[PDB]
Amino acid sequence: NVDITYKDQRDHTEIDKLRESVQIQFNFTDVNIERPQHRNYSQGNKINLLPNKARLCGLSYSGPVNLAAEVILTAHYSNGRQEVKRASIPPFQVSTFPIMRGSNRCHTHHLSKTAKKEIGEDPN
């Protein structure tokens, strides 16, 4: 939960002279991680990325991490009055997190031994 205050150095308008600093505040709301995915190069949606494909292509078996955020900033003037603005952000993919094989977020979790053998994995 970042909460920091930064002095502003904008000196163009008289209103810009009536200000002291910016009190920055924001927090993150929703976190989700989904199974690793591939692009397939057709300008569509993202398709499942299997471990053998990542092995052969030199990819990373990383699953997307989705985040939400809330921005509430505060404006300080010279006299001592405060202005607060708020911002709501919809879900947004921050990055990809590496995924462990055999884990719950891996593709080889619903698969049985025959399916794992069929898709190119070591079934044992």
């Binding site: 904008r10 910016v22 404006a75 911002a87």
Partner: protein, 54 residues
Amino acid sequence: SVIAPIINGFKELLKQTAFEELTQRNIIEAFSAALSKNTASDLNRSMEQSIISG
């Protein structure tokens, strides 16, 4: 490579655009600019370099 880029991006947003003229659009634009490909690349490269270096 997340909070410090956001801080510096806010510093540069304040260093060009007036704060009283800023609205929610400029707040979103500054936050999204502070989260460009540079920060994601820095964070992922640093984490993987850490895991593989030990």
